[PDB]
mmCIF file of C-alpha atoms in Angstrom:
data_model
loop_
_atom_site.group_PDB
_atom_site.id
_atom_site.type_symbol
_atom_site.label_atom_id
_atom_site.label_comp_id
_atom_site.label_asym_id
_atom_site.label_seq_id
_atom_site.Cartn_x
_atom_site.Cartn_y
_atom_site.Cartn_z
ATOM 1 C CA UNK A 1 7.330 125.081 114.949
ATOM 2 C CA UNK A 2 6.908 121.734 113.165
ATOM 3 C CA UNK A 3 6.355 119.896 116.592
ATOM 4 C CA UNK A 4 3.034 121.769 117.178
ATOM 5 C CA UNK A 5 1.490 120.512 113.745
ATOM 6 C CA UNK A 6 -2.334 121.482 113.932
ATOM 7 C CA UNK A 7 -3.997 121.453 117.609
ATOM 8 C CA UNK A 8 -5.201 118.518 117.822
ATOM 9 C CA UNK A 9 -6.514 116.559 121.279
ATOM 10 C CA UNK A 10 -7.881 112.920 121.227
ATOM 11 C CA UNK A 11 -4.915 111.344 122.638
ATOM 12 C CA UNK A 12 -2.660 114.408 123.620
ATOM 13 C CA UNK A 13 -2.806 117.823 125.831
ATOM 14 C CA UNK A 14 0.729 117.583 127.726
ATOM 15 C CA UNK A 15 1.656 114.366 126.556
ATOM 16 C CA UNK A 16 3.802 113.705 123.630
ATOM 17 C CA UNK A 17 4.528 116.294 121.167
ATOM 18 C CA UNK A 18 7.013 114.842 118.098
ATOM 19 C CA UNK A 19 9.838 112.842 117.881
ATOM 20 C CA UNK A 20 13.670 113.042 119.162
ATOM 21 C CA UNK A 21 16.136 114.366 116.615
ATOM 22 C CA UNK A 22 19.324 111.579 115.847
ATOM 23 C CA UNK A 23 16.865 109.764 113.727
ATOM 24 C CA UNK A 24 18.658 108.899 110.243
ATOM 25 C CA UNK A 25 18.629 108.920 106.492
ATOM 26 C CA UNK A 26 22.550 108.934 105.815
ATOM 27 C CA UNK A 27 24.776 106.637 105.801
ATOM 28 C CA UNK A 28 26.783 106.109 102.184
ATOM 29 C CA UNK A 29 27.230 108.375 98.860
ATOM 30 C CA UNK A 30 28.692 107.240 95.728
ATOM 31 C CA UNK A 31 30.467 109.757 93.412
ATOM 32 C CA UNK A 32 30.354 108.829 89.913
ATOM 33 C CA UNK A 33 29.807 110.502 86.624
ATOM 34 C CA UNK A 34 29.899 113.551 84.643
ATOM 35 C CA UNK A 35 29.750 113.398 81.227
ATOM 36 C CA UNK A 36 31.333 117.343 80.870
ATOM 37 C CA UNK A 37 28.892 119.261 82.281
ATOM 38 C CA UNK A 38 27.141 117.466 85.450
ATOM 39 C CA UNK A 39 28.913 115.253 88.241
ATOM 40 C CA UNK A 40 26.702 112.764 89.431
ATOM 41 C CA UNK A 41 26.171 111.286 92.924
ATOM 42 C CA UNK A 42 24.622 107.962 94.012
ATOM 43 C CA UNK A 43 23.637 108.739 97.964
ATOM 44 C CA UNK A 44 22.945 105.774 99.698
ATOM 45 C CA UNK A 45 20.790 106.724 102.657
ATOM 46 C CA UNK A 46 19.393 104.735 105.782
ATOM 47 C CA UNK A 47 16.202 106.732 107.341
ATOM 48 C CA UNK A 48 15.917 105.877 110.974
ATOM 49 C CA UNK A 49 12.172 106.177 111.919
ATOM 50 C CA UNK A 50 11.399 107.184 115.547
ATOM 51 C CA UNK A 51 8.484 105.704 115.933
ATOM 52 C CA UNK A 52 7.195 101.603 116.450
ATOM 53 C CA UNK A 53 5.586 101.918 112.893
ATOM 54 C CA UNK A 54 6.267 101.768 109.124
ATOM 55 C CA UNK A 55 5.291 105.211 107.931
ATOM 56 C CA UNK A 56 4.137 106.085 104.636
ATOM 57 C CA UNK A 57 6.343 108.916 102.725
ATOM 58 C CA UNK A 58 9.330 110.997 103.853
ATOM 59 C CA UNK A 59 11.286 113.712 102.540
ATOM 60 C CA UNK A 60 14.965 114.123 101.538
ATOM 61 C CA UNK A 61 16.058 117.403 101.382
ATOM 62 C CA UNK A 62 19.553 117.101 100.444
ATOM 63 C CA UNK A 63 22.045 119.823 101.031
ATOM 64 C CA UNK A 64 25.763 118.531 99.680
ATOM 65 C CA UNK A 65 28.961 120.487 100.041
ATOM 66 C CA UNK A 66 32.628 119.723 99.363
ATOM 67 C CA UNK A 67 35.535 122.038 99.932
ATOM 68 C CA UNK A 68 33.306 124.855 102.100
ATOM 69 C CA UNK A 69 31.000 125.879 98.965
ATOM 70 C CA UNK A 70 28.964 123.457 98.048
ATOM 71 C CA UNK A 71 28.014 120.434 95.807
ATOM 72 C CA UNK A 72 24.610 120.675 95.079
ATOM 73 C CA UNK A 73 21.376 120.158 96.825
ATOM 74 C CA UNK A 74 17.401 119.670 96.564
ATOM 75 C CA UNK A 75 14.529 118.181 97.867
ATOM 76 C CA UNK A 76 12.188 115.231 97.004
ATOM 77 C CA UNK A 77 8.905 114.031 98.534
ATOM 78 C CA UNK A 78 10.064 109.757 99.134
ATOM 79 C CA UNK A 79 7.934 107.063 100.042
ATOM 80 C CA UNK A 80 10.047 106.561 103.210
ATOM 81 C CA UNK A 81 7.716 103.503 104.441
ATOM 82 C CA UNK A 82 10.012 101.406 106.251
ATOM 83 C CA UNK A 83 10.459 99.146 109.667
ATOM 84 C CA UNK A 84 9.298 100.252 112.843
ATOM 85 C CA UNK A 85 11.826 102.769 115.381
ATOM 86 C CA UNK A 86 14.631 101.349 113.010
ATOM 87 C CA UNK A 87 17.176 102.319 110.103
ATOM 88 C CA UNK A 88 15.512 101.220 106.077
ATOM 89 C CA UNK A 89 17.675 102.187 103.417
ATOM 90 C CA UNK A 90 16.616 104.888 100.943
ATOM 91 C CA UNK A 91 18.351 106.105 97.680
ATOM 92 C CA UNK A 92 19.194 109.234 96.408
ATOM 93 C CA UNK A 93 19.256 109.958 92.327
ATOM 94 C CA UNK A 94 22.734 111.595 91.684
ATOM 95 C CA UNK A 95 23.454 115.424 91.855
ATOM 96 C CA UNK A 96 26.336 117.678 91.463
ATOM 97 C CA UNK A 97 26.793 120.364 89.297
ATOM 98 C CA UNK A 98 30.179 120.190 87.238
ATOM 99 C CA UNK A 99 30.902 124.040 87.982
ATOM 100 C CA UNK A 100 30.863 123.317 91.592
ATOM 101 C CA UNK A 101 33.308 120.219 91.829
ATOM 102 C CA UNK A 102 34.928 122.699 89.341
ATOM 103 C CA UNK A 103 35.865 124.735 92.095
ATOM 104 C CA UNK A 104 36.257 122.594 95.340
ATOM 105 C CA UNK A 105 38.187 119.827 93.527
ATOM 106 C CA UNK A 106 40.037 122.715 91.851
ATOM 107 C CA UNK A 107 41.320 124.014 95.242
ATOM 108 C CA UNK A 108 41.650 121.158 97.286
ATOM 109 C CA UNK A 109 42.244 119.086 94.632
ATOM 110 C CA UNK A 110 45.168 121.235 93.709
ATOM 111 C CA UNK A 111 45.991 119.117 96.814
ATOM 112 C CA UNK A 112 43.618 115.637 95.763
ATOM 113 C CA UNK A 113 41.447 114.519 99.089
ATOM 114 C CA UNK A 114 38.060 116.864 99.486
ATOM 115 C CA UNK A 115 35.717 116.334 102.289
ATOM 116 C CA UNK A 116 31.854 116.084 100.958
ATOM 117 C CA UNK A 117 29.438 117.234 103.588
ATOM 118 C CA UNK A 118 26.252 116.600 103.528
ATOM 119 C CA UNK A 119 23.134 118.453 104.838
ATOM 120 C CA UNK A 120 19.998 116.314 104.795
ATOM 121 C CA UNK A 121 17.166 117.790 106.044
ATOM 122 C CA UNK A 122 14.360 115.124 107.616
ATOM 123 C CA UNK A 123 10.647 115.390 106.746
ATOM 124 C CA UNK A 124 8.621 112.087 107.529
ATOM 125 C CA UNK A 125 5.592 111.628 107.747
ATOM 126 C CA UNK A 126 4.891 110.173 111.184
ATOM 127 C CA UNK A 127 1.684 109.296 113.264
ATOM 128 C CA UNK A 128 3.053 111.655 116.190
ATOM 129 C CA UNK A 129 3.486 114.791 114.385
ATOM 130 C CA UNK A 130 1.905 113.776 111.036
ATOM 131 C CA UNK A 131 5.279 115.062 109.766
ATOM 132 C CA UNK A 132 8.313 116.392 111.160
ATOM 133 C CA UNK A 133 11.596 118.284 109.826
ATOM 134 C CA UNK A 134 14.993 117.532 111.855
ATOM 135 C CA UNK A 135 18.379 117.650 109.586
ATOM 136 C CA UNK A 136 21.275 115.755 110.212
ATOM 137 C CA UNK A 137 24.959 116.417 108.239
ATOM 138 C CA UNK A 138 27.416 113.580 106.742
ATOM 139 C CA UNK A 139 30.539 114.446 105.580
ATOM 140 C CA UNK A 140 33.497 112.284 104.185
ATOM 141 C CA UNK A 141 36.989 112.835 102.668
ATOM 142 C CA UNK A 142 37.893 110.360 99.874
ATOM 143 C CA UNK A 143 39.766 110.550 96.656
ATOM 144 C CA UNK A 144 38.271 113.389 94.362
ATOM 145 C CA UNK A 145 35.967 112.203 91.293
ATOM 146 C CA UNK A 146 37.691 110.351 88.355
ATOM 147 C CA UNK A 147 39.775 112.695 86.323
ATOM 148 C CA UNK A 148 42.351 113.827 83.873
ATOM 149 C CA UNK A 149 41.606 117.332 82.968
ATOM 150 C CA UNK A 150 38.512 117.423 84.891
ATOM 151 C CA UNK A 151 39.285 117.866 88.632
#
């Protein structure tokens, strides 16, 4: 388990182990493009560090659904350096596959509103675990991705 990174003493033995869980890096994503064969996604996120200190680098491992398939998803090594046991806002580049929208927006959008879920998985670099893993999920239904013959 990712808590019990490398036994270790100086400070420790029964005493701490890693950090809580509802600790952040969501909180906005902005659909935009696709030329004809990519959608792409601007993902605003805010990364709530646990602990009194700016840390150094973080991971976003992204995880994006729409209808119930998907929407894409990877992972990228951040420098998540930020506040102290507060929220810093972090930016994601833009990623979903045309083919996928293809199909959610297809469905649903045979309708028009699709929910987009995402499922961000939490690696940061901390001085309590060195690095932890804890995911969190946002998802949101808005208006489906500009159109015409697209969906």
């Amino acid at each position: 388990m990712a808590s019990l990174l490398d036994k270790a003493k100086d400070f420790v033995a029964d005493k701490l182990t890693a950090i809580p869980k509802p600790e952040g890096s969501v909180t906005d994503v902005d659909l935009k493009d696709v030329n004809r064969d990519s959608v792409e996604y601007l993902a605003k996120v805010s990364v709530t560090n646990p602990y009194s200190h700016s840390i150094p680098i973080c991971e976003i491992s992204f995880t994006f659904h729409s209808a119930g398939r998907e929407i894409g998803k990877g992972k990228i090594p951040d420098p998540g350096s930020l506040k102290a046991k507060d929220m810093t806002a972090l930016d994601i580049p833009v990623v979903v596959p045309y083919s996928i929208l293809f199909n959610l927006a297809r469905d649903v959008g045979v309708d028009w509103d699709i929910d987009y879920e995402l499922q961000i998985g939490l690696t940061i670099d901390l001085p309590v675990v060195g690095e932890f893993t804890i995911p969190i999920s946002s998802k949101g239904e808005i208006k489906l991705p500009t159109f015409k013959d697209f969906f």
